From a paper:
Mtb persister formation is dependent on the trehalose catalytic shift, a stress-responsive metabolic remodeling mechanism in which the disaccharide trehalose is liberated from cell surface glycolipids and repurposed as an internal carbon source to meet energy and redox demands. Here, using a biofilm-persister model, metabolomics, and cryo-electron microscopy (EM), we found that azidodeoxy- and aminodeoxy-d-trehalose analogues block the Mtb trehalose catalytic shift through inhibition of trehalose synthase TreS (Rv0126), which catalyzes the isomerization of trehalose to maltose. Specifically, TreS-catalyzed isomerization of recycled trehalose into maltose is a key step in the trehalose catalytic shift that promotes Mtb survival during stress. Although TreS is not strictly essential for Mtb viability under favorable growth conditions, it is required for the formation of biofilm persisters and can therefore, in principle, be conditionally targeted as a persistence factor.
Numbering used by the authors:
A (entry chain B), C (entry chain B): 34 to 45, 50 to 52, 59 to 62, 65 to 67, 70 to 81, 85 to 102, 107 to 680
B (entry chain A): 32 to 38, 42 to 44, 55 to 70, 87 to 88, 95 to 98, 108 to 680
Write the structure that this text describes.
Amino acid sequence: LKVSDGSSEIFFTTPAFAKGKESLRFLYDGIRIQTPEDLDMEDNDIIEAHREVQGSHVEGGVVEHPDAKDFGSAAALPADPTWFKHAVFYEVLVRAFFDASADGSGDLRGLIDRLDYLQWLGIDCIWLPPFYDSPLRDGGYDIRDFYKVLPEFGTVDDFVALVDAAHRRGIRIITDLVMNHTSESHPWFQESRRDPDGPYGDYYVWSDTSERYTDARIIFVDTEESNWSFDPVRRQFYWHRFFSHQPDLNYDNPAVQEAMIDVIRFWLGLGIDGFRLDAVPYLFEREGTNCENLPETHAFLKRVRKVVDDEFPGRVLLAEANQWPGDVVEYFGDPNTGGDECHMAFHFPLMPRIFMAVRRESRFPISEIIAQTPPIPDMAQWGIFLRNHDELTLEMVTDEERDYMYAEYAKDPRMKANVGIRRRLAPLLDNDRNQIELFTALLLSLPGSPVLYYGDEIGMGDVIWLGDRDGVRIPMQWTPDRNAGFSTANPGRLYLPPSQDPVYGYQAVNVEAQRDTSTSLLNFTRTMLAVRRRHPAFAVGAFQELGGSNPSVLAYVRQVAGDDGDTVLCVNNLSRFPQPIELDLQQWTNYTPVELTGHVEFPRIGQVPYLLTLPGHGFYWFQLTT
Amino acid sequence: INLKVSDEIFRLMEAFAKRQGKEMDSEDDIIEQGSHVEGGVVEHPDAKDFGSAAALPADPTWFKHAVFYEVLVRAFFDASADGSGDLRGLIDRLDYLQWLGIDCIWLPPFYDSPLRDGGYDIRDFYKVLPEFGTVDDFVALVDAAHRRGIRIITDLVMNHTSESHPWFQESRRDPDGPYGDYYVWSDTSERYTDARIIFVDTEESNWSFDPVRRQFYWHRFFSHQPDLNYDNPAVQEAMIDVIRFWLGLGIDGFRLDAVPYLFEREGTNCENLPETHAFLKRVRKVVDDEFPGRVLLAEANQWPGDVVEYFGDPNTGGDECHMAFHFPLMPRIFMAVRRESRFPISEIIAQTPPIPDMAQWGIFLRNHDELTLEMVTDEERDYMYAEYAKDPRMKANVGIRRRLAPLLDNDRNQIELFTALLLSLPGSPVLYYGDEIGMGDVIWLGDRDGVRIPMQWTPDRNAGFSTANPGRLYLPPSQDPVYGYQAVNVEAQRDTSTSLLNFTRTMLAVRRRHPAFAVGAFQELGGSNPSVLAYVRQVAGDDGDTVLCVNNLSRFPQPIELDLQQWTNYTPVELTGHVEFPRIGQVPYLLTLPGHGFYWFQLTT
Amino acid sequence: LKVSDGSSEIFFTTPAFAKGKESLRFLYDGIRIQTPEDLDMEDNDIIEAHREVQGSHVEGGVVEHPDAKDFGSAAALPADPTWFKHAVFYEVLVRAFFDASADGSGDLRGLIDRLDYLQWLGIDCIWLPPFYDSPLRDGGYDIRDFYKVLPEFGTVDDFVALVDAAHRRGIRIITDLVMNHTSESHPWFQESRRDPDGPYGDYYVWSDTSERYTDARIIFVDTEESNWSFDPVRRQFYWHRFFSHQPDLNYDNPAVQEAMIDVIRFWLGLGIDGFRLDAVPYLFEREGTNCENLPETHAFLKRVRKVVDDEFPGRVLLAEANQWPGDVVEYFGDPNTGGDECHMAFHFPLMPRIFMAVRRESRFPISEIIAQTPPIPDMAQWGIFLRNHDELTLEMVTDEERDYMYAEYAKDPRMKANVGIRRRLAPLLDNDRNQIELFTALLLSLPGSPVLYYGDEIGMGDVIWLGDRDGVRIPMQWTPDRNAGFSTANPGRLYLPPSQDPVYGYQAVNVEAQRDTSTSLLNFTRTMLAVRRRHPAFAVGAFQELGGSNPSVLAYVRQVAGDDGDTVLCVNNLSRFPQPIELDLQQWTNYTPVELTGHVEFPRIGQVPYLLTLPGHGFYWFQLTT
Ligand SMILES: [Ca+2]
Ligand SMILES: [Ca+2]
Ligand SMILES: [Ca+2]
Ligand SMILES: [Ca+2]
C-alpha cells in the first residue's frame, strides 16, 4: 500500500506516516477513511494525506464580518505616544521567517518561536507585510478578505498570540494595509458587479465610458494599458489604479470610508500597535486632476488619525508614499496642528543619494537632501530604511525639478542595472563588509526611525531571477541544515528554495555561524543596535552637519536638547581611501569625545579645528560628555 | 588618477575586454533589420535578401523516420558571452546532437518578441530576437545542421501576434488604413459568447478595449496577444508569406500553434471551424507546390479523435497537417505504472482513430503543452478522467511543465521504461533537452519556465553553458544537491558507461537500425499478466523488420506468457546485446522481467 | 570493448579515448598493442591506458650523476648581489599550482603557464619546496636522487624552461635542499649498507652501539625512539636525526661534502638563483655535545658560501633554522666579515608574537623581539613569512630563558589548538578581513624580505584533516570550475581534492572571482605589493619605532639612509576598537605625510605630537616628503 502527500511516499485484517506531524487527513480513492478488506483495497493501492468563525460571511446580500470581541484580548503595553521615534523596525515576511507547521511556508506560529532572536538582536517593533486572505496575484497586496488572515499562515487567534508574546518582551507589531484597492475575489467587488442596486453596488468606481479621469498616469505602464477595465458582469468600466485584478475603493461613498476605518478598529481592537497605509495618494479621484494627493484624500487621513487618537491611544500610522520630500510632508498633516495625519512618512530618496555619494566619494549628495528636507511636526518622525524602491511599485523617487542628481543615477552601472529590482544591502554593495558597516552606521544615526529588512543583518543576498520583488523575499537562513533550518519539511514542498548561492547561501551565511563568531556582521549590527539604544540622541536628537575641511567625509552631531543632554558625534568617510578632516566643533569646547564601541577616550575638543583620520569607508561614533 | 570600469576593475578598454572573455570592439570615476513601416505599409524582407542554406535530398517521409529534439535556443549554449543562449552557440553544439543520434531539432519561437508570454507573442515575423542572434545566423544553422543529416523545425504562432506588432499598432491607429482590418474589432463585448476562456484565472473576457481605437479586439490568449481576422484575405496571404520566408531560407517545417482558434463564427465555440481546416488545406497546397518535402505540425490541446481531421482528407493521403500530437499518452503511461496494469496504455491505442498514409502521430513525454498548461481529458471518452485527481503526484504537478526525472523521483528504472515506450510506440518521438541526462527542474521560477533552465554541460562554472558572469545569466543553472550540474551534466555522463546519456544514445542507435519502430504496424499481444505490455512492430512484406517489445509496469519481477505463433520458427535477438534467445515454437513463449524493466527483441529469420 | 585507465572508462576487422591527451600507451592482457582478430579479442574485453638521461646511474660500484653541461643553458639576469633584500618571495608547491599534463598532479609544465598571474600579482621570486626524486615518505624532504626531478612533476629540461621563462619576466627561482639527510632509497645509502669497503661505505654514520651521541635530543619524539636504527643489511646502527628512513649524511667524510656542494653547482649551473638549506643545525655530530650548531657545521657553510661567491656570483643562500634570534644570527656568519655564510636567515618568532599581540591588544610583544633581535651583516636580510612553524619539524621557536611570552602561548585557545599544525593566514585569523589586511601590512613593512604562501593572497583555507603539514598543501583555487581549474582531469585521479569548504572552498574564493572584483583581498595584496615596490625603504630602510601615547598601536618609520632618502611611516592598530595616538615625529618636522594608496595629503608634521586616529585593526601608510 502507498501512502503519499505529493512529495513524500512510504510503502507498507490490520487496521507511521504521521511520525513530524500529529492533524493529517487520509483518504483512499476519494473516501475519507479513519482494514483493507472493509474498503476493497488491493495490492499497490494509494492513500492520500491532506491537511485538515474563520472568515467574513456574505449573508442576505450583505458581507458580514466578525468583531474584535469574538477573539481573545491581547495585553497591551504601557502607553507611550512617542515610542515610534525611539523604535528600530524589522520588516519581515511571515512567509519567510520560520515554518512551525512544517507545511513548506512560513507561518505566524513560527514567528513566536523566533522572538527570542529578535530581542537578542535588539529590535523594538516588527513590521509585517500584508498577510490577510488573498489570491497572491500581487504579493498579498490584493486583499480578498480583510477579516481573514491567509490560511497558509494561520488563524487570527495565532495573531493574537503573537501580539501577546511579542508584547511580553517589549516589542510591538505593525503591518501594511492596502487602502486604495482590494482584489476581484473580495466579496465587496463581486457584489458590485452582480447587485448594483444592492448595498455594495457603489463601493467601487463605475463608468459607462473610459474617457474619464484621463489626466492620471498609469503606474504599471508595462503591464496595464488603462486604469479602466470592462467588467464582463456589470458591463461597465471599473477603476483600477494598479492592476486589473485590483479595483480601487470608492471613498466617495461614506460607507466605504466607514467600512475601511472599521477594519482599522478590528486589528487595533485585537492588539496591534501600528499601520503602514499603502497606496494612499490614490484614494480619491477627480476629473481634471492627476487623481493624486487630492485634499479630500488628506481629509480622510485626518479623520482616521483622530479615530485612532480617540479610540486607540498610543498607536502609530505610517504612510507609503513614493513622493519627493516636500510632497510627502503633506501626509504628516498641517504643521501647526502638531500632527493630524500619519505619524510617520518614509524618506525614500535617502540611500539613492547615499549610494551615489559613496560612488562619487562626496558628502554633497547627502547634505543636499537633508537641507532640502522640510521640517516635520515635533511628534512625528521620518521613516528611514535601506532600500531604493518601495515594495508595491518597484520605482525610485525622483523629481525632474528638485533633484539635481536626476540625470546622474542612470550614469551609474550598478544603478542602471538594478532598476526596478529590490535588492538587499549586501548584493547592492558587492558584499563589501566595509561598505555594509558604513551604510548601517548611517541608517542607525541619521534623523528618523530606522527600518531593517530581515536577513540584511547577517548579509543575505537575493535570487533576483525569482522575481523583481520576490527575489528579495527568500527564506531566512538560520542554520546550515536542510531548508536553512527554516522548515523541517520536504525541500520540494517549500514556498521558495533557500538560496544556495556560493557566497550568499545559507551554507556560507546564517545566524548560527555568525552568532558563534566574533567579528561577524550579526554581532556588529547587534553591537550598534545596543549602542544606539543607550543614546536617545540617535532617535530624537537634533541634526547639525558640522564644518569640514574634507567633503569626502560626512560628519554630524546629534544632540538631545537641554542641559546634560545626550550628545553624540558621527563621522562617516565616503572615500575608499584614508582621509583626514578638521572639524569645526568650537560649539563643544572642553567636551571630550568617547568612542562608543570601545569606550576609548579621545582628545578633549577646544577652539582649534578638531583633527580626525578615517580609513576607506570607515566611521566613528563618539559621545560628547562634560 | 584612478578609474573604475564597470558593466568592476579599477589599455583599460582592452584589459577589461580580455578579462570578460569578449572582443575589444564588441584627457580627451566610472566607465560604462526585420520589418519596417513606410508610412502606412509594413514592409517585410524577402527570402532572397539573404544567402540560401543548403537543403537535404527530398524525403517525403523523413518526418516518420525521425526522432525530434526540442531545445530552447536561450538554454543550450551561449557563445556571445552575454549570459543568454543564442543561435551562434547552438551550431557549436551540433556535434553533441549528431553524436546523440537525433534526426531533427524542434525550436521554440525565437522571433523578435517582448517576452510577455515565453516568446509566443510575436512582435515581428521577419526578425530573429536580437539576443538569440540574427536571420543570417539561422542560415548558418540550417546549413550546418544539414551538412550532417540533421533538420530544423520551429514553432510558428498562427492565431495571434504580439500587441507590439506593427500590424496591430497601425490597426488601432489607422482603422481606415490597409491594416485596420488585420484584426477582429467590436463595439460590444456580447459577441462570440459561446466560446470558453482558456486562461480562466488570468483573463475575464476574450474581448479587450483598446484606448486608442476605442473598440474591442479579440484575443484567444492574453491581452497583449490579439487574435487575427483570418476572414481578411490579405491576412492569409501575409501569413503564408511568412511561411514562404523561412522555407525559402531552408527550414524543413513548422509547428502551427493555436490553430484551433483561427476563424470565429457566432453561435459556435470558435473551435475547429471548417474554414480553419480549409485554410490549412490551402497552406498545405502552397507548401507542397513550392517546397516539396516539408512538414506541418499541428499544436492542438485536443483529444485524439478531435485532432485526427487536422491530418486532412485520408483519400488524398493527407492534404493538411502531416502531424498531430497524441497528448494523453504519458498521463496513461504514468497512471499505468501507478496501477501496475497495461490497460491505461492498451485502451488509448485501441481507441485512437486512423491516420492518412503519409501522416504520423507525434509522441512526446510531457503531460501538458507549452502554449497553455492544461492536461487533455474528455468526460465522455476518458475513463481515467476522474482518477488523475486520485494521484497525489499528478495532482501536485498540475499545470506545471515538469521533466521526466522529477516526475519519476529520479528512478533510473522508471526513466528507462518511459524512454523505451516513447521510442517504440507508434509515432515520431520528441525528446526535451535534459531528459537524456536526467536533468532536474527549478519550478519556482515559472510553471512553464521551470523546465527552461540552462543546459547542464560540464561541472564547471555556469554548467559550461556560458562564459559570462553568473549575474548576467538569464537564468542560473540548477545547483540542486541531486539534480544540479555538479551532480548531473553532459561531461560526466559521457564518461561513465552506466550513465543515462549512454543509455539513451544506445536506444537511439538501436532504433535507427530498425524502421519498424517508426513506420511498422502495431499489434498488441495478449498477455496472461495484465501488469506487462507486449507489442510487435512489423514491417509489411517478406523479410520485413519485425521487433518485439515487452514492458513490465509492476515494481516487482513478473512472468509473462506470450502469443507468438504468428512468428513461429523465428528467433528473438535482443537488440542491446545481440544475444540470441530460444526460437519460438507452438508453445506460449515465456519471459521474465525485473520491476519496471523492458526487453527489445528482433524476430529474425 | 572496454578502454580504461582506472577512473575513466569508454565502451566501443577495424584497426577517441585520447581525445585531452595526445602520448598514451595502450595494452591488452599485458601486451603492448599498436585488429581484434589478430589479438584474439572477444566481447567485453578490456584495454588499459598507461602513461609512457633522466636519472643518476650506479655503475661499477659508483653512483654516477650527469652534469649541468648535458642540458640547456638557461639565460640569467643582470647580476645584482642585493636583489634578495628587495624581493618578495612566493612559496608554492609545484604539486599544487597547475596541472598541465592532466595527470592529477601539479607539474612544472603548469608553473610556466601561470607565470603571468604571479607577475601581475607583483612577486619577485618563486620558492619551490623540494621536488627531486623521492619516495614521498616525508613530504619530498627524503631525497632519493638529487640529480633527478620527481617524474610526477617532470624532467630537468622542464626546470630549465621554467627558469628561462620566469627570467624573461624579471622573476627568480629558489628551492629547498635537504642537507643533513637523504632517503633510504638513495643509492648512496644502499651502497653503504651493502659495500662498506666501497667508495660509499662511510658516506653515513655507522656504529656498533647506540650509546653514542647520547646528549642529543630526539626531534620527532612522538614517532622515533632513538636517533640510532639497526640496519638489517650492514648489521650496524646508522644515525638518523629525523625519521628512520632518513639517514644523516656523514660530513666528517670530505667526499660527502664535495658531493653535496657538487649538487649545488649542478642546479646553479642550470640557472637557479637561490637555495634554502634545510636541517643545517644537524650536519655534524660530536660526542658530549647536543650535535647542534657545532662550529665545524658553520665551517662547512662558510666553504659553501665561497664556492657560490666565487663560481656562481649573484646567488642567494637561505637557512632553515628553528632557533631563537641570537642563535640564528650565527648562521649569518661572523659580523666583521660582512657575510661569510647564508645570505638570509628566517625570523621565526615574528608572528607568534604578532598573533599574541593582537590578541592582547598591545604592541609590547612585537617591540620586544625587535629590540632583542641582534644586528645582521649589511649585505644580509632577515626572512619574514606569515607562519608559526617550519614545514619540516612542525614546531614553534621558543626559548625558556629569552622569551617572556614562553608560558603565555599555551594560555591562548587558538594557539593551544593549532599546535603542530601549519595553517594559512585566513583560518588563523578566523577569516577576519580586517586582521588579514593588518597582518599583511606588517609582513610587507617590517624589516626583511617577505615570503608569501600560495593562496594566502586570496584567502584560501586548509583541510587540516588531510595532514598536519599536507592540510595547508591543497590545490590552488583558480576558477569555480571542476578541480578549481587546477587540473582538467578526473577528480578521483587528483593528488588531493580541492577544498569544498562552504567559506574557504574554490566555489566561494578563487583568483577569478577576486580578480573580477574591486575590494577583493587579491586586489588589496596586489595594491600593497605595488605600493611597496615603489619604495625601497620597505626593503632596505632603517627601522625606528616611534614614541607613542598608546601602546595599543604599533608605529614605526622606515627611512632609506641619505639625503632625499625614501621615508615611509607605518602605523598599525592592534586593538579591535578605534584608538587615538600622538606620535613623536619631531625628527621629521616640516615633513608632509602622504597616504600611499590614495595619495591623500595629511597635515604637515611639526614640533607638537602628531595626532592620528585608527579604527579596529586598521593601518596607515604615509610617505615622508619635503
Ligand atoms: Ca481610489
Ligand atoms: Ca548570445
Ligand atoms: Ca483567431
Ligand atoms: Ca648529519
